[PDB]
Amino acid sequence: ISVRGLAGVENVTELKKNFNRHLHFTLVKDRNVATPRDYYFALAHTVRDHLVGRWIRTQQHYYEKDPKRIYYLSLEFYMGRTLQNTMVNLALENACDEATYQLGLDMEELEEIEEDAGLGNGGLGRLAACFLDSMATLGLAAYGYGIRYEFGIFNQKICGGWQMEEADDWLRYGNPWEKARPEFTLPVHFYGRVEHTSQGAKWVDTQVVLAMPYDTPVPGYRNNVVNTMRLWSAKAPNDFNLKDFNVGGYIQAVLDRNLAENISRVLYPNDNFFEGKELRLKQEYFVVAATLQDIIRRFKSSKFGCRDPVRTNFDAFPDKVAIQLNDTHPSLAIPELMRVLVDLERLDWDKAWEVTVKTCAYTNHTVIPEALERWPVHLLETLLPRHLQIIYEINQRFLNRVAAAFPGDVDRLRRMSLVEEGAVKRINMAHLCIAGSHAVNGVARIHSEILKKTIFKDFYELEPHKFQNKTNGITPRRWLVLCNPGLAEIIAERIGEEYISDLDQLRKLLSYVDDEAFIRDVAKVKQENKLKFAAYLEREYKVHINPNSLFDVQVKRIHEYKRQLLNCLHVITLYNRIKKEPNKFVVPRTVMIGGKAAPGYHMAKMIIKLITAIGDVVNHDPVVGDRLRVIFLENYRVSLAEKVIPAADLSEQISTAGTEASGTGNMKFMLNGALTIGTMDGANVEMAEEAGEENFFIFGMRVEDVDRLDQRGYNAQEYYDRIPELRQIIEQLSSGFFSPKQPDLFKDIVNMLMHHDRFKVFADYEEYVKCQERVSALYKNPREWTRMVIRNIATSGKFSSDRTIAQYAREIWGVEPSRQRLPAPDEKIP
Amino acid sequence: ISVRGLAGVENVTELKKNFNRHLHFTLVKDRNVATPRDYYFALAHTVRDHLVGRWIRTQQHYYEKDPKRIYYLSLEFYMGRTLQNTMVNLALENACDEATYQLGLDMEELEEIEEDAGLGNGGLGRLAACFLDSMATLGLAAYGYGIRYEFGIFNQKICGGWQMEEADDWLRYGNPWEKARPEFTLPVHFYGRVEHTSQGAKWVDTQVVLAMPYDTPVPGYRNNVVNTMRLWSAKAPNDFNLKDFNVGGYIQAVLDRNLAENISRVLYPNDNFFEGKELRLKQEYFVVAATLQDIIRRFKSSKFGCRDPVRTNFDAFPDKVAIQLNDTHPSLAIPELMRVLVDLERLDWDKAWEVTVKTCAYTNHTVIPEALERWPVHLLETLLPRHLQIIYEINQRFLNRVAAAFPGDVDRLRRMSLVEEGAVKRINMAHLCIAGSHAVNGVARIHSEILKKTIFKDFYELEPHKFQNKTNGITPRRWLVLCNPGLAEIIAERIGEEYISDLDQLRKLLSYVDDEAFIRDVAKVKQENKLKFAAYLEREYKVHINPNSLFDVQVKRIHEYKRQLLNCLHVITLYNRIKKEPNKFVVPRTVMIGGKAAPGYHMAKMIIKLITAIGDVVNHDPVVGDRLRVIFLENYRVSLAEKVIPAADLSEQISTAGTEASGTGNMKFMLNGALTIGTMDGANVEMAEEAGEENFFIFGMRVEDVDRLDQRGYNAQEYYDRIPELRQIIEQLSSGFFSPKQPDLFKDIVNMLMHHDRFKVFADYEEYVKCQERVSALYKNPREWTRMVIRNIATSGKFSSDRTIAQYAREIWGVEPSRQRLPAPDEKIP
Ligand SMILES: O=c1[nH]cnc2c1ncn2[C@@H]1O[C@H](COP(=O)(O)O)[C@@H](O)[C@H]1O
Ligand SMILES: O=c1[nH]cnc2c1ncn2[C@@H]1O[C@H](COP(=O)(O)O)[C@@H](O)[C@H]1O
Ligand SMILES: *Cc1c(COP(=O)(O)O)cnc(C)c1O
Ligand SMILES: *Cc1c(COP(=O)(O)O)cnc(C)c1O
Ligand SMILES: CC(=O)N[C@@H]1O[C@H](CO)[C@@H](O)[C@H](O)[C@H]1O
Numbered sequence A, B: 001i002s003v004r005g006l007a008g009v010e011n012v013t014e015l016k017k018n019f020n021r022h023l024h025f026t027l028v029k030d031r032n033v034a035t036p037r038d039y040y041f042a043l044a045h046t047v048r049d050h051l052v053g054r055w056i057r058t059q060q061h062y063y064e065k066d067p068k069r070i071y072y073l074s075l076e077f078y079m080g081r082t083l084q085n086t087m088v089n090l091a092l093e094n095a096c097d098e099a100t101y102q103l104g105l106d107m108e109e110l111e112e113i114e115e116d117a118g119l120g121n122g123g124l125g126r127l128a129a130c131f132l133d134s135m136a137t138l139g140l141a142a143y144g145y146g147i148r149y150e151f152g153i154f155n156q157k158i159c160g161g162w163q164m165e166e167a168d169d170w171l172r173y174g175n176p177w178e179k180a181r182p183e184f185t186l187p188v189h190f191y192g193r194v195e196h197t198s199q200g201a202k203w204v205d206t207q208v209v210l211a212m213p214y215d216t217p218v219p220g221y222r223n224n225v226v227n228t229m230r231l232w233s234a235k236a237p238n239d240f241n242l243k244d245f246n247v248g249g250y251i252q253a254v255l256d257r258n259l260a261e262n263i264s265r266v267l268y269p270n271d272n273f274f275e276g277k278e279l280r281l282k283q284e285y286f287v288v289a290a291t292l293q294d295i296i297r298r299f300k301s302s303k304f305g306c307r308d309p310v311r312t313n314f315d316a317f318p319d320k321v322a323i324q325l326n327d328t329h330p331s332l333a334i335p336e337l338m339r340v341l342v343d344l345e346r347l348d349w350d351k352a353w354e355v356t357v358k359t360c361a362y363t364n365h366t367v368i369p370e371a372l373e374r375w376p377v378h379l380l381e382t383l384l385p386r387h388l389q390i391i392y393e394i395n396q397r398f399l400n401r402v403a404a405a406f407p408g409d410v411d412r413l414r415r416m417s418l419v420e421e422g423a424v425k426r427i428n429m430a431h432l433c434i435a436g437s438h439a440v441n442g443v444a445r446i447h448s449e450i451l452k453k454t455i456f457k458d459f460y461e462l463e464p465h466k467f468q469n470k471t472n473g474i475t476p477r478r479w480l481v482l483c484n485p486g487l488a489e490i491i492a493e494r495i496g497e498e499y500i501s502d503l504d505q506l507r508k509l510l511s512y513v514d515d516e517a518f519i520r521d522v523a524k525v526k527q528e529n530k531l532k533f534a535a536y537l538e539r540e541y542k543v544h545i546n547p548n549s550l551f552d553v554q555v556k557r558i559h560e561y562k563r564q565l566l567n568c569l570h571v572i573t574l575y576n577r578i579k580k581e582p583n584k585f586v587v588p589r590t591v592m593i594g595g596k597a598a599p600g601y602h603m604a605k606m607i608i609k610l611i612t613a614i615g616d617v618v619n620h621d622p623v624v625g626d627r628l629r630v631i632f633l634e635n636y637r638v639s640l641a642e643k644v645i646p647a648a649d650l651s652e653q654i655s656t657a658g659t660e661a662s663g664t665g666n667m668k669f670m671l672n673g674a675l676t677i678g679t680m681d682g683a684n685v686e687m688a689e690e691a692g693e694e695n696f697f698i699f700g701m702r703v704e705d706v707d708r709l710d711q712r713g714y715n716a717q718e719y720y721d722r723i724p725e726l727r728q729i730i731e732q733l734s735s736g737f738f739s740p741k742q743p744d745l746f747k748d749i750v751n752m753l754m755h756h757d758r759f760k761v762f763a764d765y766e767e768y769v770k771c772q773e774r775v776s777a778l779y780k781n782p783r784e785w786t787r788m789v790i791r792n793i794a795t796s797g798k799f800s801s802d803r804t805i806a807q808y809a810r811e812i813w814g815v816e817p818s819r820q821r822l823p824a825p826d827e828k829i830p
């Protein structure tokens, strides 16, 4: 059937009865009233059964051996569905497929019922999920720590061409993967004040919110290692949240509990944008405060909570603990670690600081100013008074370090301060993370260099040793084996299976680049994938596309820097050229653009309306025929990505050079047989470098050109004046060609494009369409297109998150990865 | 070990492995980290497994045979713990005791971990729970329908002698008994307006709240019947509760979902008191609207949703459906049934009314005015506009019936109206229920007569056939076999086991009233029970009592009508007499008073403070010694009741004649070997009548005397003037003898007692203490005390809820009870 494992005789039989056990005993249903949803859960529970045994021994193991622990703190974990992924990592896919088949059910139909775990916005959240999978696969004693939002990223609905947001109630029917652990609930404090008494400061008169943990299993790939993702939920104490007496109402007091519990209610839907709301700040401290208590408790036990030197010596803390900051969101972990060590454990400042710096590491994910966290002091002042005092003291000591290093450099001092003066004082969370971490890293080579040259230049001059790079990656399991079994099978037919956990081996595929059978196969799976997607489209969304055309897709969050607008300009151009010479042949294309716009991002929502507007015109022009279709992919999310990416021919990664830190979607397309048209931005550079620039469609300004242009000054009018095709498009938008009933509907987009384009869309237009002509030329030559594809696939190995994690492990955490199978799952009951 | 069933070889082995399965696979724990709470859940899940098989076949059965269905609507279901009760009804107690013993665990210790299902206030809520157990035991196709509050009755804490309320988070660790059924979620409407168009009225522009059901199994006693209790939970739709666009905030919109979900958040802690809050009204319509859709859906299928006359003829509705209104709380079921039939199904008014009256039955539970539901019209007007119109139309037609029956009786017309004029117009829910039901019943013979003679006199003259009586009862399973196995065993030793489901057989115990061994045994179990309670007291609450003294206990909600104050006066008297003649012998007593006071009931909370105040003085007076102890039983609830009642010697049922509808606690004490001192009120009359007034301690005013006194006019001063002992007590309270630091602390109680005692406490004082002297005299004669006890126990049979249900069944519902074992639980998988 494929290498989805063995469909053993004993195990298919075993699976079937357990499926039935659960349907009866767990779901309390009988075959006669069971619906597809019931069947999905019976299966889910049956599969979950297979990893609890391994989950328990893995955790017990780490307790016995006591290795260094890795704590990945992130406010986002974009997990997606977990049924299939679990089957794949446990080698259960074929057995389950067989068993469910014998029970008369279609496994694929059941898999579509699972709701996505959308606890993330986009790239940052998904990176965390791929990292968790890789850390498990590499046998690291790692823990993912986050917030269990009851409402993840909103579900996007397109009404009249506009995006409509609606709550994502992903828990509505329950989550069979998580295990509530109310017995490990911890208290988290807010507000209050600071008392300075005799031997130390005291955080007093605080409001308490309880943090209840929920554990979700994270299975490594076929190694019997099952790590843990612990998500915190907010709960109101039953005392003060009722007991602070003297009139108000008993009923009201109970109803007001949903005020402390609102902390973990919903994820902020912002991607690369900072919103300074108090609720956000509360979520940030909440996950930090609860997680740290968990970290220290585990440390206090270790082998120190037995003997060792005997005396809670936190000197070995950094040898046993490593906490990674996914962006600045969990940045309060630094001052909180200090608070606990100094205030509670009573360590002297300097010893406490040494420990803190040695265990913390920060990962930066963007360079755009509006995405940078700068919290107003009055907020920290009210909500976390002691932390503000600690931050000021950290700043004081740090600046003294700077002054001593650069005597008389008074401007440098204000520039490096963690405290920003002005309208309202703010705290630069990024500066805090650099100062309190022993390593700071970028997510792609150019992004890392930009940090050193630009944004954190002064910090780099002060401590050059801190700055590193760790190019992002993606997991070959979900992003190849899971979403594209067809391609994985033909690859395995030639080079085996060891590449799934050793992607570098894909290079061996280079020697089949001239193999006639392979070329035919690679081309066959892609055709099957396009056919399956073309079907899904009419199935679930309804209104035909042509599977023979080039599948041109750009799927990512809607941003001005991602330039969906630039993609739009090209589409209109294609249309206008066709309308000019109707009877001239052109390579047919289906351009699919999908992504979510943050609810408050007016421009982003305007762009979504433009895309649908273009499709209204283009898709109903008889002269165009089936040569050009414009489709907006609705509710783009992980599960949808697993469907489009394998069916894509052209991947669009066209951000303005220097704005996309790394990107990961690009990698997803490269490993799945799509060719890339893009700018020298983020990881695109390392990808082209790995496949060879001849097998990539690079165009536009490099970072240097962008800067040259900024010195000069960017004037869009120039481009408007010298390019008639471009002029024609702008006047089409301005006159209502794309919005008849509301002719001035797109005035904001035009106005912006002409007068305040921060991402110089016009500057890359000419080279972009020129380049698009080149891909169309190559598509006309199937054999050569496929051979170039083989060149990309065979060379994508470097982009596996196993590589990224292995580097974090060795160069930052100080631990050694291991591909050693944990001693089976085997029963056992001590 | 006892007759807790057989501890079979095969089944104890089977139990043990399943216990282990769950501990591993369900709880995801290993023996080395498992805590008593974990063990409790492993067991709970193991036990729950045994009734899912029976649950499924019972429900399938009713679908096949299609008998008349009984729907018990109540806003309260005081369930308590359910582990032991399930073992008892499934004959699993000894096997589980054995198995857990072999696993090295104490079952009793694990049973104490289960949280109480406190979805009720007191008697009304508990009646519903005993009814459910009886309906299952009598094989009725019955369904309990209510609200799944996430916060039940508050947990009571005594701080400085005062009651402190704190949220009852009973779901904190989960509920292993319920089964969420999100797939059967139904919509419920609120607000909106009424449109009158061409062919009918339309309820429009409403706010929608979703009702998600949760099913809990209700096992009959050893008959393999497992009925269902369906509890509704409020959920916000994800559309409008987000989709009603045009600024407000996306985040705020999601946070505001907890506004529609607040409907099922907390139970109103009022006992026999009406609070006209909008939230309450919403809860009332919510349970009614959701339940009815469920009822009609089931009816539409039946055997009509196949063939029958073919044409949705609701003429057979009353033949297939019976809905019982537990008080007026679910009274909106009447106009709602009309709305659906008329507005949606399009039946003519008269045919719809005929059906409605024929399927609805109302049970009244109190005669005090402040407990009567009278909803302001402006509220119904805003929240349920169409229902108000239907109520006015019902009133219109009803009053026309009255006018035609009593021509010219204009006062009668205003008196019987469902609409009350005055300050603000109100709707008398009780009048609504009488008019729209074919049967109205009281809960005790005297209470029923009072309804006919007083409160509903006019209604009785109009339709005498509607009024009936159904004396309350309690379930012998939980209230004898479960809480008092010792007594059940010795009874079974002589007369067998058939009495558990046929309590009348207890009469056979009359012939052992002179049996020397029996007298010794009955006396032995009571001594063991008192010893076990005396221990629990020091275990969980701490500060000694004497097991040889008479256990004088009064446990029920704190009310002015229950007269805990009268009990207080006696206690102080005992104290004062002892202080007068210290070296005179008196029968030692431990008087235990426990109960919860509604949060807003100032007087009730003042009484709790008085009780503790008396104990502070009495319990620390060296002269008193161990002859008199005053203890306030904290957090009285079902699980605590299962502990005190079996250990009681004297049961206090001293309400003012004519105020306690029936009472049920009294019955609980009678069946467990306690003697009763009380007034001729509620079921006390039928109890004394059943055991013989010679075996009961009756005192005080009868209903007639109370009325005589009211004609005359009640003057407490008279009693104060003629009774020195009484005068002495009042002056002790007035001068601060019981409240040194705050001498005027009890001025409200004294002021009330002397000037506004609605329940004439002083009027029954003399006869009360006189009577108390008689019980003390009899206690001095162990042999005769026990023989009188045997006379009560042997004669309590009539007070089993099986008897009550059998009567409801035959005289109201039109169904025949059956003690036929359902065809085993046996596997099966169609
Ligand atoms: O005190 C202990 N004795 C034995 N095993 C322990 C103990 N504490 C933790 N463990 C094991 O380690 C796992 C880890 O627990 P953690 O503290 O949540 O990381 C537990 O489920 C146990 O298997
Ligand atoms: O359409 C049907 N076919 C077969 N069995 C049914 C059907 N509808 C209800 N049942 C059975 O009756 C039980 C009652 O469902 P209810 O409608 O919630 O009372 C279900 O769990 C099934 O066993
Ligand atoms: C991988 C992924 C992302 C990241 O896309 P980029 O092109 O790097 O912005 C965002 N959303 C989803 C659902 C993804 O799977
Ligand atoms: C039976 C019961 C009641 C009813 O007591 P009465 O004496 O009838 O008022 C109230 N509370 C609990 C917990 C009960 O078990
Ligand atoms: C702040 C933020 O979300 N940054 C995003 O992080 C992901 C994962 O590193 C990058 O691939 C992406 O380019 C970048 O925009």
Ligand SMILES: CC(=O)N[C@@H]1O[C@H](CO)[C@@H](O)[C@H](O)[C@H]1O
Residues within 6 Å of the ligand: B123, B124, B127, B271, B272, B327, B365, B366, B371, B443, B472, B660, B661, B662, B663, B664, B682
């Ligand atoms: C309104 C109300 O709660 N009434 C209560 O109902 C229970 C059960 O019928 C009676 O025993 C009790 O005397 C009465 O006070």
